[PDB]
């Protein structure tokens, strides 16, 4: 079928056209969440280890962990769930899906690689493909670049260069939760207002008590 092999050391993913009967065979009788070596599937794969990641059936229906009984099934799925895309608030919908087990009923399965064998995969394992960005928050960057609590990350930023067509310039994230005297001043206002309202109501109660003592005098 169509194997979609994902190598996360490179963030790479590739398609392959698995055409051999006896070698698509050996995948039989396995589950989702299961690891096997692609060894007798290919001398090039010899040693390579994949944990089965998913697949869409011959009609497109997916597989999913704990969806055994190797043929389709219709199930009510929700938000924070695979293979159902909620569309409104509190949306909770029945739709179909294929079984969690191996079978010849996908056009397409995807595997993620675990261990690497002796040979190399021409297009997939070779490349080096990025996180097109880096983080944004002050803390994230402190950790992403190994700094102390006070190292003032501001310059460490790996910033996106861009030529307009020729005109080159730089920009970068809006580091949120980075300390400012503005944060200081607003927390300070909070503490102010706290004690100040305390004392205003304290004096008002004092006045009211004085008035009460006056009335008692009368």
């Amino acid at each position: 079928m169509k194997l979609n092999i994902s190598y996360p050391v490179n963030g790479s993913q590739k398609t392959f056209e698995i055409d051999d009967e006896h070698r698509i065979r050996v995948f039989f009788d396995k589950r989702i969440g299961q690891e096997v070596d692609g060894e007798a599937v290919g001398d090039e794969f010899k040693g390579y280890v994949f944990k089965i990641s998913g697949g869409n059936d011959k009609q497109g229906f997916p597989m999913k962990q704990g969806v055994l009984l190797p043929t389709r099934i219709k199930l009510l799925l929700t938000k924070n769930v695979s293979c159902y895309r909620p569309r409104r608030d509190g949306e909770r919908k029945r739709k179909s899906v294929r079984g969690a087990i191996v079978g010849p009923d996908l056009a397409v399965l995807a595997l993620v690689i675990v261990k690497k064998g002796e040979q190399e995969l021409e297009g997939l394992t070779d490349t080096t493909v990025p996180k097109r960005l880096g983080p944004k928050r002050a803390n994230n960057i402190r950790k992403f670049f190994g700094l102390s609590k006070e190292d003032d990350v501001r310059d460490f930023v790996i910033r996106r260069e861009v030529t307009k067509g020729e005109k080159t310039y730089t920009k970068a994230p809006k580091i949120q939760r980075l300390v400012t005297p503005q944060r200081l001043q607003r927390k300070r206002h909070q503490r102010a207002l706290k004690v100040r309202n305390a004392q205003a109501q304290r004096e008002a109660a004092a006045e009211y008590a004085q008035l009460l003592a006056k009335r008692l005098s009368e």
Binding site: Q201, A204, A205, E207, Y208, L211
Partner: protein, 260 residues
């Protein structure tokens, strides 16, 4: 009906907003704020239906976005926020202060007050109650509460609260002699006295209010709204005085006024 009627029907709107069967589809749907909309009187209706400044809602919206107003100490950017009785409208680039109070027809009259007197208003106390924290508060007739009153204040009387931080000032009780304005129904708009109150408890007493021409009328307790002592209105009074013109006297006034 799973919700609020998010609009309002023409030939459902207030007949006292002084509007037409003509003129489109709808009324403003007053969104949230203090006064009750049937007892409120919002801004576009003053601006456009009582005092006539602007044509489109687009006009009135950019007006309010530049905020040409104060009302009892604050603007508001809802085109039809619920303002109302004894509120103190001020309009600054024009320098007009109007006070809000019913006509002798029940219509909120165009009654100019001064920017002095744009600093105090009547508050007709609904209950002076023992709040939490030992905060003794008192709620009033414009959507409010306030603490540390003159604790001699008690229910159905009215007080002189200022504008913006409030801070209760001298008040007017409810007994034989209090100068009256009336605020609901047929005796709506009227002015008179408290020559007696018939306390019909369980809710909703009654009061005989007698106008300055010695004609008497029984009004609802919460229709009653004293406004000072006899010969001492705490504020300025309208054209009409709520002295209850008959159409006879109105027609006589027409055929007298028109000419010379």
């Amino acid at each position: 009906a799973r919700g609020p009627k998010k609009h309002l029907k023409r030939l459902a709107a207030p007949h006292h907003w002084l509007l037409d069967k003509l003129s489109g589809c709808y009324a403003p749907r007053p969104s949230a704020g203090p006064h009750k909309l049937r007892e409120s009187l919002p801004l576009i209706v003053f601006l456009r239906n009582r005092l006539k400044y602007a044509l489109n809602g687009r006009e009135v919206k950019a007006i309010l976005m530049q905020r040409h107003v104060k009302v009892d100490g604050k603007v508001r950017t809802d085109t039809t926020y619920p303002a109302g009785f004894m509120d103190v409208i001020t309009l600054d680039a024009t320098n007009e202060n109007f006070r809000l109070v019913y006509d002798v027809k029940g219509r909120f009259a165009v009654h100019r007050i001064t920017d002095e007197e744009a600093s105090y208003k009547l508050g007709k106390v609904k209950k002076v109650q023992l709040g939490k924290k030992g905060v003794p508060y008192v709620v009033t007739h414009d959507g409010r509460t306030i603490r540390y009153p003159d604790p001699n204040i008690k229910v159905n009387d009215t007080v002189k609260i200022d504008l913006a931080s409030g801070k209760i000032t001298d008040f007017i009780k409810f007994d034989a002699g209090k100068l009256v304005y009336v605020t609901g129904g047929r005796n709506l708009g009227r002015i008179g006295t408290i020559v007696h109150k018939e306390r019909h408890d369980g809710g909703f007493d009654l009061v005989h209010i007698k106008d300055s021409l010695d004609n008497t009328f029984v009004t609802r307790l919460n229709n009653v709204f004293v406004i000072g002592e006899q010969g001492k209105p705490y504020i300025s009074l309208p054209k009409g005085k709520g002295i209850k013109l008959s159409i006879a006297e109105e027609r006589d006034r027409r055929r007298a006024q028109q000419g010379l």
